[PDB]
């Protein structure tokens, strides 16, 4: 009834649908907005240019 | 340790006048070291942080 031989050996070759490959993992550089410095009013020096 | 960034600075500028503010001082640095090590372990980028 269970499709075996007289000894119990199976009569149908099975299959398992092999697992789908390794996996690729990558890294990347990340950048953010960056500002600059400001300027203040200047002092008046005592010496010439 | 209840310390802010300004409170940490004022404790630094003490002539060893540390009674038990050291408990606040070491707790502030302990958490700071934890945060830095967590960022380094995760390899977080400066942009994301």
Please say whether the beta carbons of B41 and B33 come within 8 A.
Answer: no
Closest CA to B38 of B27, B49, B24: B49
User: What's the CA gap between A10 and B24, in Å, rounded?
Assistant: 74
Cα–Cα distance for residue pair B3/B9, rounded to 1 Å: 9
For residue A33, give how far its alpha carbon lies from the nearest alpha carbon of chain B (Å).
9
Collapse the DSSP code of A13 into the 3-class scheme (helix H, G, I; strand E, B; otherwise coil) and give the result: coil
Do B24 and B3 meet the contact criterion of CB atoms below 8 Å apart? yes
CA distance A28 to B47: 12
Q: What is the dihedral of CA B43, B46, B48, B49, to 10 degrees?
A: 90
The closest alpha carbon to B24, from B13, B39, B36, B8, belongs to B8
Q: Does B5 touch chain A if contact means CB atoms closer than 8 Å? A: no
Token code pair at residue B45: 């980028």
Given the structure tokens 């269970």, which residue do they identify? A2
Q: Are A12 and B27 in contact (CB under 8 A)?
A: no
- Nominal resolution in Å? 3.1
Q: Which residues of A touch B47 (CB under 8 A)?
A: 30-32
d(CA A14, CA A2): 14
3-state secondary structure of A10: strand
Name the method of structure determination: X-ray
Residue B24, number of CB atoms within 10 A of its CB? 16
Distance (Å, rounded) from C-alpha A31 to C-alpha B47?
5
């Amino acid at each position: 009834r269970h499709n075996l031989s007289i000894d119990g050996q199976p009569l149908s070759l099975a299959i398992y649908a092999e697992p789908t490959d390794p996996k690729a993992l990558l890294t990347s550089m990340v950048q953010a907005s960056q500002g600059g410095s400001a300027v203040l009013p200047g002092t008046l020096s005592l010496y010439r240019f | 340790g209840g310390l802010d960034i300004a409170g940490f600075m004022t404790l630094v500028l003490k002539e060893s006048l540390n009674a038990n503010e050291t408990t606040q001082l070491v707790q502030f640095c302990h958490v700071m070291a934890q945060l830095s090590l967590s960022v380094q372990t995760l390899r977080l980028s400066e942009a994301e942080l």
